[PDB]
Design an enzyme around this catalytic site. Structure first.
Site, PDB file in Angstrom:
ATOM      1  N   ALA A  64      -8.726 -43.822  82.206  1.00  0.00           N
ATOM      2  CA  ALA A  64      -9.343 -42.521  81.929  1.00  0.00           C
ATOM      3  C   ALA A  64      -8.439 -41.362  82.360  1.00  0.00           C
ATOM      4  CB  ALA A  64     -10.688 -42.432  82.627  1.00  0.00           C
ATOM      5  N   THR A  78      -3.855 -46.584  86.924  1.00  0.00           N
ATOM      6  CA  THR A  78      -3.073 -47.670  87.530  1.00  0.00           C
ATOM      7  C   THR A  78      -2.463 -47.281  88.885  1.00  0.00           C
ATOM      8  OG1 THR A  78      -1.020 -47.117  86.324  1.00  0.00           O
ATOM      9  CG2 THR A  78      -2.551 -48.743  85.310  1.00  0.00           C
ATOM     10  N   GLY A  90     -15.203 -34.327  89.360  1.00  0.00           N
ATOM     11  CA  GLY A  90     -15.954 -33.568  90.356  1.00  0.00           C
ATOM     12  C   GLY A  90     -17.188 -34.300  90.881  1.00  0.00           C
ATOM     13  N   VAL A 135      -6.308 -53.789  85.273  1.00  0.00           N
ATOM     14  CA  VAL A 135      -7.187 -54.722  84.539  1.00  0.00           C
ATOM     15  C   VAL A 135      -6.615 -56.138  84.363  1.00  0.00           C
ATOM     16  CG1 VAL A 135      -8.404 -52.853  83.323  1.00  0.00           C
ATOM     17  CG2 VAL A 135      -6.525 -54.059  82.179  1.00  0.00           C
ATOM     18  N   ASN A 162      -0.027 -54.752  61.394  1.00  0.00           N
ATOM     19  CA  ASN A 162       1.048 -53.763  61.300  1.00  0.00           C
ATOM     20  C   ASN A 162       2.340 -54.427  61.692  1.00  0.00           C
ATOM     21  OD1 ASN A 162       2.203 -51.218  60.824  1.00  0.00           O
ATOM     22  ND2 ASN A 162       1.978 -50.592  62.969  1.00  0.00           N
ATOM     23  N   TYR A 168       0.025 -56.679  69.613  1.00  0.00           N
ATOM     24  CA  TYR A 168      -1.061 -55.705  69.713  1.00  0.00           C
ATOM     25  C   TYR A 168      -2.190 -56.095  68.756  1.00  0.00           C
ATOM     26  CZ  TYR A 168      -3.021 -50.918  69.898  1.00  0.00           C
ATOM     27  OH  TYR A 168      -3.788 -49.797  70.018  1.00  0.00           O
ATOM     28  N   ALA A 206      -4.234 -59.018  70.026  1.00  0.00           N
ATOM     29  CA  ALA A 206      -5.168 -58.627  71.056  1.00  0.00           C
ATOM     30  C   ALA A 206      -6.333 -57.828  70.492  1.00  0.00           C
ATOM     31  CB  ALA A 206      -4.454 -57.812  72.139  1.00  0.00           C
ATOM     32  N   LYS A 207      -6.032 -56.895  69.591  1.00  0.00           N
ATOM     33  CA  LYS A 207      -7.084 -56.001  69.075  1.00  0.00           C
ATOM     34  C   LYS A 207      -8.015 -56.718  68.097  1.00  0.00           C
ATOM     35  CE  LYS A 207      -5.970 -52.162  71.336  1.00  0.00           C
ATOM     36  NZ  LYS A 207      -6.874 -51.647  72.388  1.00  0.00           N
ATOM     37  N   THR A 210     -18.127 -53.402  64.636  1.00  0.00           N
ATOM     38  CA  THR A 210     -16.913 -52.623  64.793  1.00  0.00           C
ATOM     39  C   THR A 210     -17.114 -51.325  64.027  1.00  0.00           C
ATOM     40  OG1 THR A 210     -15.607 -54.645  64.887  1.00  0.00           O
ATOM     41  CG2 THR A 210     -14.419 -52.600  64.398  1.00  0.00           C
TER      42      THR A 210
HETATM   43  N1  LIG Z   1      -3.499 -43.383  70.555  1.00  0.00           N
HETATM   44  C1  LIG Z   1      -3.890 -44.019  69.469  1.00  0.00           C
HETATM   45  O1  LIG Z   1      -3.587 -43.617  68.352  1.00  0.00           O
HETATM   46  C2  LIG Z   1      -4.728 -45.258  69.533  1.00  0.00           C
HETATM   47  C3  LIG Z   1      -5.133 -45.877  70.703  1.00  0.00           C
HETATM   48  N2  LIG Z   1      -5.879 -46.994  70.660  1.00  0.00           N
HETATM   49  C4  LIG Z   1      -6.325 -47.629  71.897  1.00  0.00           C
HETATM   50  O2  LIG Z   1      -6.991 -46.647  72.697  1.00  0.00           O
HETATM   51  C5  LIG Z   1      -6.866 -46.985  74.078  1.00  0.00           C
HETATM   52  C6  LIG Z   1      -6.351 -45.778  74.872  1.00  0.00           C
HETATM   53  O3  LIG Z   1      -5.203 -45.377  74.165  1.00  0.00           O
HETATM   54  P1  LIG Z   1      -4.473 -43.977  74.460  1.00  0.00           P
HETATM   55  O4  LIG Z   1      -5.415 -42.974  75.075  1.00  0.00           O
HETATM   56  O5  LIG Z   1      -3.753 -43.667  73.176  1.00  0.00           O
HETATM   57  O6  LIG Z   1      -3.409 -44.514  75.544  1.00  0.00           O
HETATM   58  P2  LIG Z   1      -2.667 -43.868  76.868  1.00  0.00           P
HETATM   59  O7  LIG Z   1      -1.375 -44.632  76.888  1.00  0.00           O
HETATM   60  O8  LIG Z   1      -2.706 -42.345  76.861  1.00  0.00           O
HETATM   61  O9  LIG Z   1      -3.581 -44.323  78.068  1.00  0.00           O
HETATM   62  C7  LIG Z   1      -3.692 -45.684  78.458  1.00  0.00           C
HETATM   63  C8  LIG Z   1      -4.595 -45.762  79.668  1.00  0.00           C
HETATM   64  O10 LIG Z   1      -4.706 -47.129  80.043  1.00  0.00           O
HETATM   65  C9  LIG Z   1      -4.307 -47.283  81.402  1.00  0.00           C
HETATM   66  N3  LIG Z   1      -3.663 -48.577  81.663  1.00  0.00           N
HETATM   67  C10 LIG Z   1      -2.520 -49.082  81.152  1.00  0.00           C
HETATM   68  N4  LIG Z   1      -2.275 -50.306  81.645  1.00  0.00           N
HETATM   69  C11 LIG Z   1      -3.265 -50.601  82.497  1.00  0.00           C
HETATM   70  C12 LIG Z   1      -3.611 -51.738  83.368  1.00  0.00           C
HETATM   71  N5  LIG Z   1      -2.811 -52.822  83.436  1.00  0.00           N
HETATM   72  N6  LIG Z   1      -4.751 -51.645  84.094  1.00  0.00           N
HETATM   73  C13 LIG Z   1      -5.553 -50.557  84.034  1.00  0.00           C
HETATM   74  N7  LIG Z   1      -5.289 -49.477  83.264  1.00  0.00           N
HETATM   75  C14 LIG Z   1      -4.180 -49.458  82.494  1.00  0.00           C
HETATM   76  C15 LIG Z   1      -3.382 -46.111  81.680  1.00  0.00           C
HETATM   77  O11 LIG Z   1      -3.301 -45.832  83.075  1.00  0.00           O
HETATM   78  P3  LIG Z   1      -2.159 -44.819  83.673  1.00  0.00           P
HETATM   79  O12 LIG Z   1      -2.539 -43.422  83.327  1.00  0.00           O
HETATM   80  O13 LIG Z   1      -2.317 -45.164  85.141  1.00  0.00           O
HETATM   81  O14 LIG Z   1      -0.858 -45.236  83.052  1.00  0.00           O
HETATM   82  C16 LIG Z   1      -4.033 -45.009  80.873  1.00  0.00           C
HETATM   83  O15 LIG Z   1      -5.077 -44.364  81.601  1.00  0.00           O
HETATM   84  C17 LIG Z   1      -5.931 -48.191  74.126  1.00  0.00           C
HETATM   85  O16 LIG Z   1      -6.717 -49.375  74.278  1.00  0.00           O
HETATM   86  C18 LIG Z   1      -5.228 -48.185  72.795  1.00  0.00           C
HETATM   87  O17 LIG Z   1      -4.795 -49.481  72.375  1.00  0.00           O
HETATM   88  C19 LIG Z   1      -6.315 -47.511  69.500  1.00  0.00           C
HETATM   89  C20 LIG Z   1      -5.967 -46.997  68.280  1.00  0.00           C
HETATM   90  C21 LIG Z   1      -5.153 -45.806  68.201  1.00  0.00           C
HETATM   91 NA    NA Z   2     -18.521 -50.877  60.796  1.00  0.00          NA
END
Ligand SMILES: NC(=O)C1=CN([C@@H]2O[C@H](COP(=O)(O)OP(=O)(O)OC[C@H]3O[C@@H](n4cnc5c(N)ncnc54)[C@H](OP(=O)(O)O)[C@@H]3O)[C@@H](O)[C@H]2O)C=CC1
Ligand code: NA
Ligand SMILES: NC(=O)C1=CN([C@@H]2O[C@H](COP(=O)(O)OP(=O)(O)OC[C@H]3O[C@@H](n4cnc5c(N)ncnc54)[C@H](OP(=O)(O)O)[C@@H]3O)[C@@H](O)[C@H]2O)C=CC1
Ligand SMILES: NC(=O)C1=CN([C@@H]2O[C@H](COP(=O)(O)OP(=O)(O)OC[C@H]3O[C@@H](n4cnc5c(N)ncnc54)[C@H](OP(=O)(O)O)[C@@H]3O)[C@@H](O)[C@H]2O)C=CC1
Ligand SMILES: NC(=O)C1=CN([C@@H]2O[C@H](COP(=O)(O)OP(=O)(O)OC[C@H]3O[C@@H](n4cnc5c(N)ncnc54)[C@H](OP(=O)(O)O)[C@@H]3O)[C@@H](O)[C@H]2O)C=CC1
Ligand code: NA
Lengths: 243, 243, 243, 243
Positions: free
Chosen positions: D12, D36, D49, D59, D144, D150, D153-154, D233
């Site tokens: 988050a 992380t 807050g 994770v 892709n 990826y 997993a997805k 989904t």
């Molecule tokens: N951006 C996109 O276009 C898309 C994203 N997604 C999916 O959305 C989700 C979030 O993506 P997005 O916001 O783009 O990614 P970001 O790379 O901005 O954020 C990833 C988040 O996951 C955390 N993270 C990474 N590795 C671990 C771990 N081992 N344990 C716990 N937390 C971890 C990071 O922590 P830290 O800040 O500490 O690094 C970060 O908060 C993902 O699952 C991604 O596959 C799906 C489709 C499209």
């Molecule tokens: Na659907």
């Protein structure tokens, strides 16, 4: 139909894997079938006779994979057709599911597909011809209580296959999944009457599938007559699920 | 092989339909192929020779359907394999689409599937054996701008097929869809050089499909080697879409 | 949430259609709900009060469609949100299915979607904003014995919606389907105990859905918070089917 | 609203995960967001807050998962809503993909879903209420090139989710996937000008999605207005893919 082609069928000891191997042989292929023990590899060599051999393969062990592929390349040639059939189950409701039951299923049923596919792809790309066919399951598409691990692996190999298909399609290689429903095996033969009836109630066809029926589907996709099918899942389930 | 099976292939003048009819003959079926005119029917009779016959059929006309099936029953016997290949396009963006362009597509491409399937089902149910295969399209699953009518029909025949499959599965009849991508035919040749480049860019295989490639898929499903496949859509699109 | 927006909900007399209308009103829309009789239109006017009105609409009659849309344009403005909810069933196994039972279902459940969507699209395109939401069914995806007509219409409207979505997406209009499973209606309330139990056995959630639950899904897709959802089917079925 | 519900949002720190956490707070949830690192956790605590807290979570580490859930139970209570948002990419064509790039993706993007879901399920089953929502990807459904890991997993987390959904549906828990298309975040910004043009050409909406648009979808499914949606989904991709 497969004259001059070399096929590798993982988990070819019995049932689906053996039916695949036998069908490919019947249509002209040279087949290498695999088992997890040297004795299983012997039994495969025995039924294949002049049309191939058995080898001991552990699809979770990288060194075992390289050894098997080098043996095939020495004795036969480059693999034209890979059938990823090896797979296991470790069923449990999620709160009873052990970490090993999760990890072993992912490793054996999903990571295997990555390893074997990568190991054969280079030669197929050079040749501008190839077939990769993975045996999935209806459970990958529908889900099933007590099989969240198995469902994850079987769904995951579809995502894998679609992506690999996109990478290799322009060089005449197809990458597909055959997804069986309930197939008659030694396992289902040992079930009670009430248990078999519970299975059959789920299947509009009102029967279990045969191992040969899965082999027929695989042989079709492996053939020259399926060159324009890629990234596809062929469901063979008697109507148990329909997408 | 199809020794002593009777197949009806609607719209067998050219392209995919002709390739289906020729393949089914080559594998031992007695084939009845149809065209919308008597001149077209004779051309079909010419290529089928001693292994079949051409007939004039309009799949939107109940009297034509009835007459054709009576002719088949009188000369050959009951239909074992129905291939619903007849179909048209009436392309337009929704804002320009005329009522006729919607209705003619629904009648020709969707309601035909109902009428022909119903007309052969009784005899298949009695024999406890049958095949119904309808030629869909990638567009039924993907959608396509300018083809909302065609897509509605091609998606609709999948819903139809799943439902019929559920009704008849327990009596050894299968009901399936083959969904081609872009195939080199008189439906496609009319595109421009830049439309063709635009289509090719969407196909990972990097080529249009051949009519024979769809025939191969149809022949597989029509065979005894696809008895456990029902309510399924087999996508033959070179990777243009992957589900 | 919908302040200043005008919604047209076809078949808003009771159940799902009425819950949709009421929910849209509750979140600020002006709603026009339709029924097939002037009396039904009155009853809709009565529950909508100051927040809209009822109109008599026959979704198979082009003149009725133009009349209704001209009335809405005169009293309220251009339609921002179209919810295609009107629909019927005419169940029968295929050999018992009458031509009228096929045609009436296609006309009322599929061709209606073409007609109403086309009738509202021009104003949405000009405005660069709009929502079209059609009420499908789980049966469109899974199929069901005795509902091959209904399944054809409900699957066909997905193909339609995907194609229309592709045509209009660049101008900020989304086109989606909500697919209910078993929803509690007057029909299901009149079923025997054994009949309800037979329905519930199909649903992992172990209950019927509420009309309001479908309304919630529609209201979400109709909102500004679903601007990046298009060509999608949202299944609301308690896990009866999973894709 | 979510008055008195406890939500855990993994990953988050920014992008989609942060937008989800902020939306759930705005609608009345007590939110625990994770990063992380401890520095990342403090940044999350700052924005949450009085309505939540940031915690350090890996994770892939069972000890970290256990510690975090004990901290949540001690300060807040049992988790009512789990959002599995954490995820990474390790892109490469299969021929260049390293074992680590495969394994780290499987562990971070797929096995995490198993571990976190299992860790919250017991308390949800006791309360007869719960929400598990996992952030998938369009790539899980489409595939892709360069992302076979990826995609595995997805796609795999969908199979998992359907299976778990089947186990828990009768106790008022839903298990769903939100599958974003391309969203403007730190995962996407790294693309080139011509990659971005290439992606935009594939999206009918003609734009990237926003992180808040995914949060809106997650919040809808997490709400009491999505009780009859499970094993589903929800694709949020601007029409990039349509199923
Ligand atoms: N951006 C996109 O276009 C898309 C994203 N997604 C999916 O959305 C989700 C979030 O993506 P997005 O916001 O783009 O990614 P970001 O790379 O901005 O954020 C990833 C988040 O996951 C955390 N993270 C990474 N590795 C671990 C771990 N081992 N344990 C716990 N937390 C971890 C990071 O922590 P830290 O800040 O500490 O690094 C970060 O908060 C993902 O699952 C991604 O596959 C799906 C489709 C499209
Ligand atoms: Na659907
Ligand atoms: N109803 C059914 O039977 C269905 C089966 N399937 C799939 O069909 C495939 C065949 O399985 P099943 O039908 O259960 O029949 P089997 O159990 O006979 O086949 C499994 C095969 O996999 C091999 N194997 C197991 N672990 C490993 C490993 N670590 N490395 C290499 N090989 C291994 C076994 O080798 P050994 O012989 O040496 O033990 C065996 O030959 C599986 O992928 C399964 O998921 C799919 C749908 C339905
Ligand atoms: N070409 C392509 O790329 C694709 C085609 N398809 C589908 O494949 C099928 C065949 O397509 P294709 O070979 O390309 O098409 P063609 O246009 O070459 O052939 C169409 C056939 O259907 C017949 N036909 C047309 N209307 C009627 C009617 N009312 N009653 C009976 N028969 C009729 C025609 O008869 P006549 O010769 O008398 O005119 C002709 O034999 C169609 O269903 C089409 O939608 C699907 C995906 C891709
Ligand atoms: N379990 C369920 O109930 C499910 C329903 N659906 C769908 O929800 C929708 C609502 O149907 P249902 O739930 O059966 O409840 P209803 O029967 O109350 O709703 C049907 C509505 O359609 C109207 N209608 C019927 N024919 C026409 C016509 N020719 N022109 C205009 N309007 C017409 C009716 O008008 P009037 O009131 O004037 O008779 C009625 O208001 C349908 O599309 C149905 O397929 C989908 C999944 C599950
Ligand atoms: Na398929």
């Amino acid at each position: 139909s497969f004259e001059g082609k070399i096929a590798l069928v993982t988990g070819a000891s019995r049932g689906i894997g053996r039916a695949i191997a036998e069908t490919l042989v019947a249509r002209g292929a040279k087949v290498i079938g695999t088992a997890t023990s040297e004795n299983g590899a012997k039994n495969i060599s025995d039924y294949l006779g002049a049309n191939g051999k058995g080898l001991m393969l552990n699809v979770t062990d990288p060194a075992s994979i390289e050894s098997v592929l080098e043996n095939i390349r020495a004795e036969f040639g480059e693999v034209d057709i890979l059938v990823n059939n090896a797979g296991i189950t470790r069923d449990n409701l999620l709160m009873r599911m052990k970490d090993d039951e999760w990890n072993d299923i992912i490793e054996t049923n999903l990571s295997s597909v990555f390893r074997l596919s990568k190991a054969v792809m280079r030669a197929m790309m050079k040749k501008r011809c190839g077939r990769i066919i993975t045996i999935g399951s209806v459970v990958g598409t529908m889900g099933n209580a007590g099989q969240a691990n198995y469902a994850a692996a079987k769904a995951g190999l579809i995502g894998f296959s679609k992506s690999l298909a996109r990478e290799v399609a322009s060089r005449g290689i197809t990458v597909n999944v055959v997804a069986p429903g309930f197939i008659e095996t030694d396992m289902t033969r040992a079930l009670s009457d009430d248990q078999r009836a519970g299975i059959l109630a789920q299947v509009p066809a009102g029967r279990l599938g045969g191992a040969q029926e899965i082999a027929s589907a695989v042989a079709f996709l492996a053939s020259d007559e399926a060159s324009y099918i890629t990234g596809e899942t062929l469901h063979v389930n008697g109507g148990m699920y329909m997408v």
